[PDB]
Design a protein that fits this description.
Chain B: It comes from Escherichia coli O157:H7. This is part of a larger assembly, with 2 copies of chain A. With about 45 residues, the first copy, chain A, is an all-beta fold. Chain A has no helices and 2 strands. The first copy, chain A, has a two-stranded antiparallel sheet with strand order 1-2. In chain A, a hairpin with an 8-residue loop joins β1 and β2.
Chain lengths: ~45, ~50
């Protein structure tokens, strides 16, 4: 799941003077919808 | 590092990526064969 804005970058070039504080954020979501459609296999560790 | 954070939770400063510098020095692989003038002059092979 992503958002319509996707990844947003705010190059904060005012707040800590002498510092560019790049703020890059993405809204990420992940869920197992219909768990019947995924199968896992734990092989022997050896 | 990429931090997770929350709704209404302050954002800590993530560690900036590091840069590494490989110093590939140059070194002369020299060959200094002391051949005699005798071999060069006597032989018809042109050993040079």
């Amino acid at each position: 799941v992503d958002h319509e804005t996707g990844v947003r970058t705010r190059p904060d070039n005012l707040t800590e003077p002498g510092f560019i504080k790049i703020f890059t954020q993405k809204y990420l979501g992940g869920g197992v919808v219909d768990s019947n459609a995924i199968k896992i296999l734990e092989l022997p560790q050896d | 590092t990429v931090n997770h954070g929350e709704e209404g939770k302050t954002r800590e400063q993530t560690s900036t990526p590091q840069i590494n510098e490989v110093s590939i020095k140059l070194y002369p692989v020299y060959a200094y064969p002391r051949t005699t003038q005798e071999i060069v002059d006597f032989s018809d092979v042109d050993i040079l």
